[PDB]
Every structure is written in C-alpha cells, then in structure tokens.
Design a protein around this ligand. Structure first.
Ligand SMILES: Cc1c2c(n3c1CCOc1cc(C(N)=O)ccc1-3)CC(C)(C)CC2=O
Length: 209
C-alpha cells in the first residue's frame, strides 16, 4: 500500500524556492546529505554505549557514495540510526517547519542558499540537483520504509520490498538532465575534499562499470 501525504505549507514553499531560485553553487547539496549521514552515525554510536545490542543490525559505521550513469542517480548510503515511520511522516516535518521559517527569514535579510544546514533543513538542498528524491530507511525500532517526492506539494511512504539494509538510510537522487556532473568521479572527489574532508566516518566513493 502506497500512502500519499501533503507537505506542510512551509516545506512546500521551501522546496519551490530551492527548485525555482537562480543559484549556481549547487554542489553544497552533497555536504548537506553527508552531514545528515554523519549526525545519524553519531546517534547510533552514542546509543550503542548504553545499549550494545543496538549494533546487532550492523557494527560498521560508514558512508558510501554510489553514482549510476545508466539510471542517472547518485546514492548517499549510511549505516546511521535510520528513521522510523513517525520520523518520515510527522516528527522531522514539525522540526523542519520552524527551521524553514528561520531560513526563509534569513534569505530575505541577505543570507544565501548555502547556509541551509544551519537551519536543520539541509536535506531539502537535494532538490538543487534532483528532480526526484527516494529515501530508503531502516531504524532498529521499525520496518524498512521508502519515502519519495518529486515536490509538487506531496510525498509518498510505503513499506520497502527491495534489498534489506540492516540499519541506516539510502538517499537516492534522481538527477536533473543538466546535473549529470555529480555522477563523475573527479567532480564528487573534489566536492568531498572541499566541504566534507573532516567527517569522522569513512566515506567510500564507489566507481562505475
Ligand atoms: C529535517 C529532515 C528531513 C529529512 N532528514 C532531516 C534531518 C534529520 O533527519 C534525517 C536523517 C537522515 C539520515 N541520513 O539518517 C537523512 C535525512 C534526514 C528526511 C525526510 C524525513 C525525508 C524529510 C525531512 O524533512
């Protein structure tokens, strides 16, 4: 069963601004998604100190960057804490509403789109390069879910039927026709070195063929 939900007004407004505003510094999307992955890895690592059984779903704490030219997708995989059904539909949207308001206020005041992460809504920077974003996630206290949105004011949530993940999040970016540079090895390496060189987890850039 595929469930369709309307984004809260502020989030729809944020997504429209990201999609329609002329802003050439699109590469910052990668540091934002890597930061979301790093925060999720920090959470599962901290939780495992008071409860070691929380690592039964996987001990390895890493980030994988998977480009696919055939499918025109860039996947950001992590073995972080993951997200529950409540996080995907309710919780994160509530936190994102207040963050969006502060960000849109800052933009009006003179701030730029690259400051998005300071407002905890960095995930949405994915729409600078992607026409569609698919989020596959598995949290210890819940089932494997697939969140998906091509913006337009709606998102879908379904129980995932694909390859079981163990624990973590996969952010699949269905790239815009003119944003294929983010599938090139040399371009991804450059971006990771420039904005994500001090991430406290191994970042593996998968190569194609
Ligand atoms: C806020 C927000 C939002 C999402 N994330 C965040 C910030 C903190 O939680 C996340 C964690 C990870 C991860 N790698 O574990 C990825 C994305 C997110 C994703 C969303 C629920 C589909 C939409 C949203 O509104």
């Amino acid at each position: 069963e595929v469930e369709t939900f309307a984004f809260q007004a502020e989030i729809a407004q944020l997504m429209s601004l990201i999609i329609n505003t002329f802003y050439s510094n699109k590469e910052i999307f990668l540091r934002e998604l890597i930061s979301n992955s790093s925060d999720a890895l920090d959470k599962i690592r901290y939780e495992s100190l008071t409860d070691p059984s929380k690592l039964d779903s996987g001990k390895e704490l890493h980030i994988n960057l998977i480009p696919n030219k055939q499918d025109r997708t860039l996947t950001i995989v992590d073995t972080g804490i993951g997200m529950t059904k409540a996080d995907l539909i309710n919780n994160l949207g509530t936190i994102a509403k207040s963050g969006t308001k502060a960000f849109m206020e800052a933009l009006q005041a003179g701030a730029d789109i690259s400051m998005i992460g300071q407002f905890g809504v960095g995930f949405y920077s994915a729409y600078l390069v992607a026409e569609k974003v698919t989020v596959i996630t598995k949290h210890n206290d819940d089932e494997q879910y697939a969140w998906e949105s091509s913006a337009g004011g709606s998102f879908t949530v379904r129980t995932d039927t694909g390859e079981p993940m163990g624990r973590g999040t996969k952010v699949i970016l269905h790239l815009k026709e003119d944003q294929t540079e983010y599938l090139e090895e040399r371009r991804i390496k450059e971006i990771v070195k420039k904005h994500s060189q001090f991430i406290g987890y191994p970042i593996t850039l998968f190569v194609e063929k």
